Amino acid sequence: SRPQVTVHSLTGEATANALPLPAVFSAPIRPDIVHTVFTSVNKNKRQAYAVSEKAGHQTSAESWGTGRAVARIPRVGGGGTGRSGQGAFGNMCRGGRMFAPTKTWRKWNVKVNHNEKRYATASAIAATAVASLVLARGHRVEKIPEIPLVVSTDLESIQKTKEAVAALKAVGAHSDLLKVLKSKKLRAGKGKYRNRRWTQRRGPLVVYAEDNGIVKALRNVPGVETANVASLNLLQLAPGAHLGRFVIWTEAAFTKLDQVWGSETVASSKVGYTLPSHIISTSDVTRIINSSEIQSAIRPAGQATQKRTHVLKKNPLKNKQVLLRLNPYAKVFAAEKLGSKKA
Amino acid sequence: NFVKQLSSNNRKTRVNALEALKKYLTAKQFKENKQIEFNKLWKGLYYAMWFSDRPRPQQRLANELGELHGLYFDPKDNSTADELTTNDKAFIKFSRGFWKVMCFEWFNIDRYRLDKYLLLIRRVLFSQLKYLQSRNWDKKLVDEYIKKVLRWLPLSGSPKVYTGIPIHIVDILLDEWERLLAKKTPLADVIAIFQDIVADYNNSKVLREKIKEDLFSDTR
Amino acid sequence: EKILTPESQLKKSKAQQKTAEQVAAERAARKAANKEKRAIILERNA
Amino acid sequence: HRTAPKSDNVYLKLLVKLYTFLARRTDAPFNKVVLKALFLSKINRPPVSVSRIARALKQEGAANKTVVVVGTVTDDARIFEFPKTTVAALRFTAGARAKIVKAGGECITLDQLAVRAPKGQNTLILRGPRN
Amino acid sequence: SDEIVWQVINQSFCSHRIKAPNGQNFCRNEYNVTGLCTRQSCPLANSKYATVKCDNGKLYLYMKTPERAHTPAKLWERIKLSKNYTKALQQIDEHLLHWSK
RNA sequence: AAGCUCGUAUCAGUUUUAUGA
RNA sequence: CACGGACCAAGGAGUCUAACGUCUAUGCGAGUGUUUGGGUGUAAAACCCAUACGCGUAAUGAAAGUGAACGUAGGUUGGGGCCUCGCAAGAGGUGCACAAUCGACCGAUCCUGAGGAUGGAUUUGAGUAAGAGCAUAGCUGUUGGGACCCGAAAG
């Protein structure tokens, strides 16, 4: 059994009701999988682009031939136009056809394993209930009551945007909704004149079990995205392949998440799917290393930085003092002279 | 239940849940059987320490979690060559589950809260230990209780127990032995268990050499 | 009441002392061994 | 010579991070064998079948050993009987995991094995068929 | 846990790092002691974390307990640090009893 | 380049003795 | 020798795809592969899935067939490791993958001829030793596509 999660009301008060953790939040948080799945999935909603098949071939040029004291690039015929006697059919030429004309049949969409794709979303959900991971990702979540944040089911029934934003402001997502709206900037590229004019930060996800006007209530407040628990998009959950979006769950959604994914007790609802096993027992190493156990079967410690044994070469013959650490007889040799000896 | 009130996220309902567990433990007519209920009680008390972070209230909480072996089956009935009569029969089921909880938990405790459970298991070994009974002698309590210490936590012929908790019991049972206040007690049979661990091969060296230095090297 | 040392840090002091008293005794029995070694080297050079 | 793992699974990097510590501090040649084995690629970590674990426990005086597969433990439908033994591995397949638990024994991770056997007492390291 | 928090922000984004031309990394999470960021010198990766800050002239020492991993609303417990230097360093010491040096 | 045994007595643009045309 | 260079700006050349591999990573694993499709969707995204099919899971042959335990799926020798003794140095035991040696089962041999029984003669094998694949992605090779770019006498 898990700790358990308190559900807050629309006034931002802790109701006596508590919900068990769905055990999806005990999935392996895998940054490498989320990255290598996101990059493939972000390619899918993408259109084709190609240069025209006729472009560059809509010229009637002819190569002038050998020994004409001029470069052998195919030149346009005719006369008295300016375009006559100049280069066509060439990647280097002006008005010429580009090297490797981009064709439509490029691999636009990416095939992914269905199980790997499911792993990624489970990891992405697991990272939403960490609080430090959410803070690192962005999301001003300092003044929010608990993580993972679960609001009462009456949040779904809200029709008017004014009341719906008042629910979030009472909860504590006020700062995150002020991060967005203040972060509205012009696109820095040619994206301005390609219908990608404005760019802003991502706000909270609002996950509901079933809609009673919540999808429409929040579709105007900037940054706020909603998702039905049955779906739960990876592109929403881990935006830019960065883990841990600030997710406001609802009471009914949080209970349904047990059914949707599965645990030890409940089945799965996805055909022949189980949540993946950890290849470690504990996600932290230092409890294992700084144990009573391991530190008992271990040889004594060093200094973390060696004391420098012989740093510079002092020479004997000169420097009297080092000539006494080598050969203690040199004291006796000096006292009796010994080199100065009579026969 | 109490597993939702001792493992709450609120401080006041966990303190009030402890006080309703004090009344629930002095209501002895309902705690008659069902081992796994006691296991769930120690898992709820495990979380009930796990939400306490500050040092003074976690020491007060460790002292009263040890004291829960004192309110539950206080010594006053003080049985005479009475084998296990409603103060000693059910008590052992309240002990084993605790160690079972720690036998389940020694992976899942991080490097910052593990001092709370070293100190907790110090207080609880001192408290069961203090409730052999009010005197340190009750003989079928000694061999049945020592069978339901020997057969779970210093097994040391089974790798299922985590090797840090017997070496911690070796580190604590001498000073917490003589917190009971040179007398003669059933100590040596306890020490015979450790001699059994030195007699037991097919183990790791740490249990074999760390008790063989730490426990036997004491001049007391 | 009053605050107490953590039962990892309590162990630390104990195991440090165990190693330190060993190390000091090992060091002290090496100064004497090197002194005796010095005397052997002196008479060999003679 | 191989220095670091090519893997990007950070949990495998945590095991390397653990077993590099136990490689130099224990000075027992068990840990050096495991830490070398973690660096190996996916073709060079072949899956040890549950049948090869059963064959390995027929070994005389190996009734109370904790068998350690650095690769993956996989299920075999052909065999019926399986001893009560502690098996340590990276990946237990759902079928194999169920087979060991129902037989009586445990299926444990490599860090659990690092706790229970730091120097590596009373163990056996199996390898899958490469050729 | 926290090792998993660290590795995911060591690389794979701590979205408040400044890469200086010196190759140095600076966490601007207002609650860190060293302005630089490293393992258990930045306040997200570590679970036990102390810091001195100032809101007014009043210099508080904030403190983060792993008890409060559930609730980020009241993470940093804070204590005023008199005003005289000598008694304040002594005030500091008592709070830091039985921590990392 | 990688994997496998080994870390050796595995050898060497060398000298020497030994034994033939 | 010779071919290129008056100077300056901008343009300008190993690309994309299919077929078949290499190695590495990831998922699962005797299985594996959602995306032809259907359901659903805040809509070319994401999220679910029926029946099939693809490749692999049990081999020995030429028309006709048969079928893998004398077995801790072997006897020995080694053989990473581990255990006992020893302060060590060593010795002994158990020995993974793998290698060497002696063989067996199965099919196929040279005969014996009760349509081919039966016993002997021997070897043989991408044979069984007791499964390692499938899919995605990256790195890259091979060949075809205009195929690194430009340049020829043509029908």
PDB file of N, CA, C and O in Angstrom, chain A residues 81-138:
ATOM      1  N   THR A  81      17.819  39.416 -75.419  1.00  0.00           N
ATOM      2  CA  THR A  81      16.971  39.417 -74.216  1.00  0.00           C
ATOM      3  C   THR A  81      17.736  39.591 -72.893  1.00  0.00           C
ATOM      4  O   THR A  81      17.143  39.981 -71.880  1.00  0.00           O
ATOM      5  N   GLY A  82      19.039  39.311 -72.912  1.00  0.00           N
ATOM      6  CA  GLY A  82      19.865  39.326 -71.700  1.00  0.00           C
ATOM      7  C   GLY A  82      20.018  37.935 -71.111  1.00  0.00           C
ATOM      8  O   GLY A  82      21.107  37.561 -70.662  1.00  0.00           O
ATOM      9  N   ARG A  83      18.918  37.181 -71.120  1.00  0.00           N
ATOM     10  CA  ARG A  83      18.884  35.774 -70.704  1.00  0.00           C
ATOM     11  C   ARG A  83      19.596  34.852 -71.713  1.00  0.00           C
ATOM     12  O   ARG A  83      19.987  33.734 -71.367  1.00  0.00           O
ATOM     13  N   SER A  84      19.761  35.330 -72.948  1.00  0.00           N
ATOM     14  CA  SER A  84      20.521  34.613 -73.973  1.00  0.00           C
ATOM     15  C   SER A  84      22.021  34.641 -73.673  1.00  0.00           C
ATOM     16  O   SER A  84      22.577  35.690 -73.326  1.00  0.00           O
ATOM     17  N   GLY A  85      22.657  33.480 -73.810  1.00  0.00           N
ATOM     18  CA  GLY A  85      24.089  33.322 -73.563  1.00  0.00           C
ATOM     19  C   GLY A  85      24.471  33.299 -72.094  1.00  0.00           C
ATOM     20  O   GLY A  85      25.528  33.816 -71.720  1.00  0.00           O
ATOM     21  N   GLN A  86      23.612  32.705 -71.263  1.00  0.00           N
ATOM     22  CA  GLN A  86      23.887  32.549 -69.829  1.00  0.00           C
ATOM     23  C   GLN A  86      23.437  31.201 -69.252  1.00  0.00           C
ATOM     24  O   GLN A  86      22.544  30.546 -69.799  1.00  0.00           O
ATOM     25  N   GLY A  87      24.069  30.814 -68.143  1.00  0.00           N
ATOM     26  CA  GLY A  87      23.942  29.478 -67.560  1.00  0.00           C
ATOM     27  C   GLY A  87      22.590  29.060 -67.007  1.00  0.00           C
ATOM     28  O   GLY A  87      21.947  29.802 -66.256  1.00  0.00           O
ATOM     29  N   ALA A  88      22.174  27.859 -67.406  1.00  0.00           N
ATOM     30  CA  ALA A  88      21.022  27.159 -66.838  1.00  0.00           C
ATOM     31  C   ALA A  88      21.423  25.697 -66.597  1.00  0.00           C
ATOM     32  O   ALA A  88      22.576  25.330 -66.855  1.00  0.00           O
ATOM     33  N   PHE A  89      20.480  24.883 -66.107  1.00  0.00           N
ATOM     34  CA  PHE A  89      20.705  23.468 -65.745  1.00  0.00           C
ATOM     35  C   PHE A  89      21.981  23.271 -64.919  1.00  0.00           C
ATOM     36  O   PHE A  89      22.979  22.718 -65.405  1.00  0.00           O
ATOM     37  N   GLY A  90      21.945  23.743 -63.681  1.00  0.00           N
ATOM     38  CA  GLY A  90      23.097  23.656 -62.791  1.00  0.00           C
ATOM     39  C   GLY A  90      22.766  24.177 -61.415  1.00  0.00           C
ATOM     40  O   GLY A  90      22.074  25.192 -61.277  1.00  0.00           O
ATOM     41  N   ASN A  91      23.260  23.472 -60.400  1.00  0.00           N
ATOM     42  CA  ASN A  91      23.052  23.848 -58.998  1.00  0.00           C
ATOM     43  C   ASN A  91      23.756  25.154 -58.629  1.00  0.00           C
ATOM     44  O   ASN A  91      23.263  25.905 -57.788  1.00  0.00           O
ATOM     45  N   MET A  92      24.889  25.416 -59.280  1.00  0.00           N
ATOM     46  CA  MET A  92      25.677  26.633 -59.064  1.00  0.00           C
ATOM     47  C   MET A  92      25.127  27.853 -59.811  1.00  0.00           C
ATOM     48  O   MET A  92      25.385  28.994 -59.415  1.00  0.00           O
ATOM     49  N   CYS A  93      24.373  27.597 -60.880  1.00  0.00           N
ATOM     50  CA  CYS A  93      23.859  28.643 -61.763  1.00  0.00           C
ATOM     51  C   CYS A  93      22.717  29.432 -61.132  1.00  0.00           C
ATOM     52  O   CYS A  93      22.039  28.939 -60.226  1.00  0.00           O
ATOM     53  N   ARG A  94      22.537  30.664 -61.607  1.00  0.00           N
ATOM     54  CA  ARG A  94      21.425  31.520 -61.207  1.00  0.00           C
ATOM     55  C   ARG A  94      20.202  31.166 -62.045  1.00  0.00           C
ATOM     56  O   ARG A  94      20.293  31.042 -63.273  1.00  0.00           O
ATOM     57  N   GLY A  95      19.066  30.996 -61.371  1.00  0.00           N
ATOM     58  CA  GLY A  95      17.845  30.492 -62.000  1.00  0.00           C
ATOM     59  C   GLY A  95      17.924  29.014 -62.351  1.00  0.00           C
ATOM     60  O   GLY A  95      17.053  28.492 -63.057  1.00  0.00           O
ATOM     61  N   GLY A  96      18.967  28.345 -61.858  1.00  0.00           N
ATOM     62  CA  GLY A  96      19.179  26.922 -62.081  1.00  0.00           C
ATOM     63  C   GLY A  96      18.456  26.053 -61.072  1.00  0.00           C
ATOM     64  O   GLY A  96      17.925  26.547 -60.069  1.00  0.00           O
ATOM     65  N   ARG A  97      18.445  24.752 -61.344  1.00  0.00           N
ATOM     66  CA  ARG A  97      17.755  23.772 -60.515  1.00  0.00           C
ATOM     67  C   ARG A  97      18.648  23.315 -59.361  1.00  0.00           C
ATOM     68  O   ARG A  97      19.803  22.945 -59.580  1.00  0.00           O
ATOM     69  N   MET A  98      18.091  23.346 -58.146  1.00  0.00           N
ATOM     70  CA  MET A  98      18.813  23.040 -56.895  1.00  0.00           C
ATOM     71  C   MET A  98      19.340  21.612 -56.834  1.00  0.00           C
ATOM     72  O   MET A  98      18.768  20.711 -57.461  1.00  0.00           O
ATOM     73  N   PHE A  99      20.428  21.414 -56.087  1.00  0.00           N
ATOM     74  CA  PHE A  99      20.956  20.068 -55.862  1.00  0.00           C
ATOM     75  C   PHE A  99      20.018  19.281 -54.966  1.00  0.00           C
ATOM     76  O   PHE A  99      19.612  19.769 -53.905  1.00  0.00           O
ATOM     77  N   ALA A 100      19.722  18.055 -55.403  1.00  0.00           N
ATOM     78  CA  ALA A 100      18.757  17.157 -54.765  1.00  0.00           C
ATOM     79  C   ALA A 100      17.427  17.863 -54.482  1.00  0.00           C
ATOM     80  O   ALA A 100      17.161  18.239 -53.334  1.00  0.00           O
ATOM     81  N   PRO A 101      16.602  18.072 -55.532  1.00  0.00           N
ATOM     82  CA  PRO A 101      15.288  18.674 -55.336  1.00  0.00           C
ATOM     83  C   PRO A 101      14.491  17.867 -54.319  1.00  0.00           C
ATOM     84  O   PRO A 101      14.303  16.656 -54.494  1.00  0.00           O
ATOM     85  N   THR A 102      14.082  18.542 -53.245  1.00  0.00           N
ATOM     86  CA  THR A 102      13.346  17.931 -52.139  1.00  0.00           C
ATOM     87  C   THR A 102      12.052  17.330 -52.662  1.00  0.00           C
ATOM     88  O   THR A 102      11.221  18.042 -53.232  1.00  0.00           O
ATOM     89  N   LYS A 103      11.913  16.017 -52.501  1.00  0.00           N
ATOM     90  CA  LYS A 103      10.733  15.290 -52.980  1.00  0.00           C
ATOM     91  C   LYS A 103       9.734  15.058 -51.855  1.00  0.00           C
ATOM     92  O   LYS A 103      10.089  15.151 -50.675  1.00  0.00           O
ATOM     93  N   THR A 104       8.487  14.774 -52.230  1.00  0.00           N
ATOM     94  CA  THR A 104       7.407  14.542 -51.266  1.00  0.00           C
ATOM     95  C   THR A 104       7.602  13.269 -50.443  1.00  0.00           C
ATOM     96  O   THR A 104       7.255  13.247 -49.264  1.00  0.00           O
ATOM     97  N   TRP A 105       8.179  12.232 -51.051  1.00  0.00           N
ATOM     98  CA  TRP A 105       8.295  10.909 -50.418  1.00  0.00           C
ATOM     99  C   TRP A 105       9.438  10.723 -49.402  1.00  0.00           C
ATOM    100  O   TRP A 105       9.978   9.622 -49.257  1.00  0.00           O
ATOM    101  N   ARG A 106       9.779  11.798 -48.695  1.00  0.00           N
ATOM    102  CA  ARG A 106      10.650  11.747 -47.521  1.00  0.00           C
ATOM    103  C   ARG A 106       9.902  11.053 -46.372  1.00  0.00           C
ATOM    104  O   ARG A 106       8.670  11.111 -46.309  1.00  0.00           O
ATOM    105  N   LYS A 107      10.633  10.392 -45.478  1.00  0.00           N
ATOM    106  CA  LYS A 107      10.024   9.775 -44.294  1.00  0.00           C
ATOM    107  C   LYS A 107       9.583  10.846 -43.290  1.00  0.00           C
ATOM    108  O   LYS A 107      10.381  11.298 -42.459  1.00  0.00           O
ATOM    109  N   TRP A 108       8.318  11.256 -43.378  1.00  0.00           N
ATOM    110  CA  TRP A 108       7.785  12.316 -42.510  1.00  0.00           C
ATOM    111  C   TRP A 108       7.357  11.801 -41.136  1.00  0.00           C
ATOM    112  O   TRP A 108       7.755  12.359 -40.110  1.00  0.00           O
ATOM    113  N   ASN A 109       6.549  10.742 -41.131  1.00  0.00           N
ATOM    114  CA  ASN A 109       6.045  10.137 -39.902  1.00  0.00           C
ATOM    115  C   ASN A 109       6.973   9.032 -39.419  1.00  0.00           C
ATOM    116  O   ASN A 109       7.633   8.372 -40.231  1.00  0.00           O
ATOM    117  N   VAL A 110       7.019   8.834 -38.102  1.00  0.00           N
ATOM    118  CA  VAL A 110       7.878   7.806 -37.508  1.00  0.00           C
ATOM    119  C   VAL A 110       7.068   6.708 -36.814  1.00  0.00           C
ATOM    120  O   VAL A 110       6.258   6.977 -35.920  1.00  0.00           O
ATOM    121  N   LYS A 111       7.310   5.475 -37.258  1.00  0.00           N
ATOM    122  CA  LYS A 111       6.788   4.266 -36.630  1.00  0.00           C
ATOM    123  C   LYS A 111       7.489   4.058 -35.282  1.00  0.00           C
ATOM    124  O   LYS A 111       8.719   4.116 -35.198  1.00  0.00           O
ATOM    125  N   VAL A 112       6.696   3.849 -34.233  1.00  0.00           N
ATOM    126  CA  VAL A 112       7.210   3.556 -32.883  1.00  0.00           C
ATOM    127  C   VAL A 112       6.600   2.231 -32.402  1.00  0.00           C
ATOM    128  O   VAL A 112       5.493   1.869 -32.826  1.00  0.00           O
ATOM    129  N   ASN A 113       7.327   1.501 -31.548  1.00  0.00           N
ATOM    130  CA  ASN A 113       6.759   0.369 -30.808  1.00  0.00           C
ATOM    131  C   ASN A 113       5.654   0.892 -29.910  1.00  0.00           C
ATOM    132  O   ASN A 113       5.811   1.942 -29.284  1.00  0.00           O
ATOM    133  N   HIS A 114       4.541   0.165 -29.860  1.00  0.00           N
ATOM    134  CA  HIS A 114       3.383   0.582 -29.073  1.00  0.00           C
ATOM    135  C   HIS A 114       3.654   0.468 -27.577  1.00  0.00           C
ATOM    136  O   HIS A 114       3.146   1.272 -26.789  1.00  0.00           O
ATOM    137  N   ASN A 115       4.473  -0.516 -27.204  1.00  0.00           N
ATOM    138  CA  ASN A 115       4.843  -0.736 -25.813  1.00  0.00           C
ATOM    139  C   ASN A 115       5.824   0.316 -25.288  1.00  0.00           C
ATOM    140  O   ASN A 115       5.710   0.755 -24.138  1.00  0.00           O
ATOM    141  N   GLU A 116       6.775   0.708 -26.140  1.00  0.00           N
ATOM    142  CA  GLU A 116       7.764   1.760 -25.845  1.00  0.00           C
ATOM    143  C   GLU A 116       7.086   3.125 -25.678  1.00  0.00           C
ATOM    144  O   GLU A 116       7.483   3.930 -24.828  1.00  0.00           O
ATOM    145  N   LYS A 117       6.061   3.356 -26.502  1.00  0.00           N
ATOM    146  CA  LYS A 117       5.253   4.572 -26.505  1.00  0.00           C
ATOM    147  C   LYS A 117       4.440   4.678 -25.221  1.00  0.00           C
ATOM    148  O   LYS A 117       4.260   5.771 -24.677  1.00  0.00           O
ATOM    149  N   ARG A 118       3.956   3.530 -24.753  1.00  0.00           N
ATOM    150  CA  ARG A 118       3.202   3.432 -23.510  1.00  0.00           C
ATOM    151  C   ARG A 118       4.098   3.617 -22.291  1.00  0.00           C
ATOM    152  O   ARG A 118       3.678   4.223 -21.299  1.00  0.00           O
ATOM    153  N   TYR A 119       5.319   3.079 -22.372  1.00  0.00           N
ATOM    154  CA  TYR A 119       6.352   3.232 -21.340  1.00  0.00           C
ATOM    155  C   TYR A 119       6.639   4.719 -21.089  1.00  0.00           C
ATOM    156  O   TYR A 119       6.682   5.172 -19.939  1.00  0.00           O
ATOM    157  N   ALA A 120       6.808   5.456 -22.184  1.00  0.00           N
ATOM    158  CA  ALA A 120       7.110   6.879 -22.164  1.00  0.00           C
ATOM    159  C   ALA A 120       6.051   7.711 -21.438  1.00  0.00           C
ATOM    160  O   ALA A 120       6.399   8.573 -20.631  1.00  0.00           O
ATOM    161  N   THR A 121       4.773   7.448 -21.724  1.00  0.00           N
ATOM    162  CA  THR A 121       3.655   8.152 -21.072  1.00  0.00           C
ATOM    163  C   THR A 121       3.535   7.821 -19.584  1.00  0.00           C
ATOM    164  O   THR A 121       3.151   8.679 -18.785  1.00  0.00           O
ATOM    165  N   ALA A 122       3.868   6.579 -19.229  1.00  0.00           N
ATOM    166  CA  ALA A 122       3.894   6.125 -17.837  1.00  0.00           C
ATOM    167  C   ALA A 122       5.007   6.822 -17.060  1.00  0.00           C
ATOM    168  O   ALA A 122       4.807   7.218 -15.911  1.00  0.00           O
ATOM    169  N   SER A 123       6.166   6.966 -17.706  1.00  0.00           N
ATOM    170  CA  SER A 123       7.308   7.700 -17.156  1.00  0.00           C
ATOM    171  C   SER A 123       6.961   9.178 -16.999  1.00  0.00           C
ATOM    172  O   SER A 123       7.290   9.791 -15.983  1.00  0.00           O
ATOM    173  N   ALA A 124       6.290   9.728 -18.011  1.00  0.00           N
ATOM    174  CA  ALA A 124       5.881  11.125 -18.027  1.00  0.00           C
ATOM    175  C   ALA A 124       4.866  11.439 -16.935  1.00  0.00           C
ATOM    176  O   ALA A 124       4.932  12.512 -16.336  1.00  0.00           O
ATOM    177  N   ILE A 125       3.943  10.506 -16.684  1.00  0.00           N
ATOM    178  CA  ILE A 125       2.970  10.614 -15.586  1.00  0.00           C
ATOM    179  C   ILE A 125       3.682  10.520 -14.233  1.00  0.00           C
ATOM    180  O   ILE A 125       3.415  11.322 -13.338  1.00  0.00           O
ATOM    181  N   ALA A 126       4.602   9.557 -14.108  1.00  0.00           N
ATOM    182  CA  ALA A 126       5.386   9.349 -12.884  1.00  0.00           C
ATOM    183  C   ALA A 126       6.176  10.590 -12.463  1.00  0.00           C
ATOM    184  O   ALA A 126       6.300  10.875 -11.270  1.00  0.00           O
ATOM    185  N   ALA A 127       6.682  11.325 -13.453  1.00  0.00           N
ATOM    186  CA  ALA A 127       7.470  12.536 -13.231  1.00  0.00           C
ATOM    187  C   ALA A 127       6.635  13.764 -12.856  1.00  0.00           C
ATOM    188  O   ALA A 127       7.194  14.777 -12.421  1.00  0.00           O
ATOM    189  N   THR A 128       5.314  13.676 -13.017  1.00  0.00           N
ATOM    190  CA  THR A 128       4.416  14.777 -12.635  1.00  0.00           C
ATOM    191  C   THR A 128       4.186  14.828 -11.124  1.00  0.00           C
ATOM    192  O   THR A 128       3.782  15.868 -10.587  1.00  0.00           O
ATOM    193  N   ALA A 129       4.447  13.711 -10.446  1.00  0.00           N
ATOM    194  CA  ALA A 129       4.230  13.612  -9.006  1.00  0.00           C
ATOM    195  C   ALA A 129       5.526  13.657  -8.181  1.00  0.00           C
ATOM    196  O   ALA A 129       5.627  13.022  -7.125  1.00  0.00           O
ATOM    197  N   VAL A 130       6.502  14.433  -8.645  1.00  0.00           N
ATOM    198  CA  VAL A 130       7.816  14.493  -7.992  1.00  0.00           C
ATOM    199  C   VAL A 130       8.074  15.842  -7.309  1.00  0.00           C
ATOM    200  O   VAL A 130       8.781  15.897  -6.294  1.00  0.00           O
ATOM    201  N   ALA A 131       7.491  16.910  -7.864  1.00  0.00           N
ATOM    202  CA  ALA A 131       7.513  18.285  -7.307  1.00  0.00           C
ATOM    203  C   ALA A 131       8.806  19.057  -7.531  1.00  0.00           C
ATOM    204  O   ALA A 131       8.762  20.260  -7.809  1.00  0.00           O
ATOM    205  N   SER A 132       9.944  18.379  -7.386  1.00  0.00           N
ATOM    206  CA  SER A 132      11.240  18.961  -7.722  1.00  0.00           C
ATOM    207  C   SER A 132      11.443  18.907  -9.229  1.00  0.00           C
ATOM    208  O   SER A 132      11.907  19.883  -9.825  1.00  0.00           O
ATOM    209  N   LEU A 133      11.074  17.775  -9.836  1.00  0.00           N
ATOM    210  CA  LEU A 133      11.094  17.597 -11.290  1.00  0.00           C
ATOM    211  C   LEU A 133      10.187  18.578 -12.028  1.00  0.00           C
ATOM    212  O   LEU A 133      10.510  19.006 -13.136  1.00  0.00           O
ATOM    213  N   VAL A 134       9.058  18.920 -11.405  1.00  0.00           N
ATOM    214  CA  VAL A 134       8.113  19.920 -11.923  1.00  0.00           C
ATOM    215  C   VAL A 134       8.707  21.337 -11.825  1.00  0.00           C
ATOM    216  O   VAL A 134       8.565  22.144 -12.754  1.00  0.00           O
ATOM    217  N   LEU A 135       9.375  21.622 -10.706  1.00  0.00           N
ATOM    218  CA  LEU A 135      10.034  22.907 -10.493  1.00  0.00           C
ATOM    219  C   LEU A 135      11.209  23.134 -11.438  1.00  0.00           C
ATOM    220  O   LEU A 135      11.429  24.260 -11.896  1.00  0.00           O
ATOM    221  N   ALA A 136      11.955  22.067 -11.720  1.00  0.00           N
ATOM    222  CA  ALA A 136      13.081  22.109 -12.654  1.00  0.00           C
ATOM    223  C   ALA A 136      12.617  22.329 -14.087  1.00  0.00           C
ATOM    224  O   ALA A 136      13.253  23.065 -14.828  1.00  0.00           O
ATOM    225  N   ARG A 137      11.505  21.688 -14.451  1.00  0.00           N
ATOM    226  CA  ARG A 137      10.881  21.789 -15.776  1.00  0.00           C
ATOM    227  C   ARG A 137      10.375  23.212 -16.087  1.00  0.00           C
ATOM    228  O   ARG A 137      10.376  23.641 -17.242  1.00  0.00           O
ATOM    229  N   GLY A 138       9.985  23.944 -15.044  1.00  0.00           N
ATOM    230  CA  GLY A 138       9.511  25.321 -15.169  1.00  0.00           C
ATOM    231  C   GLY A 138       8.542  25.584 -14.039  1.00  0.00           C
ATOM    232  O   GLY A 138       8.955  25.648 -12.879  1.00  0.00           O
TER     233      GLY A 138
END
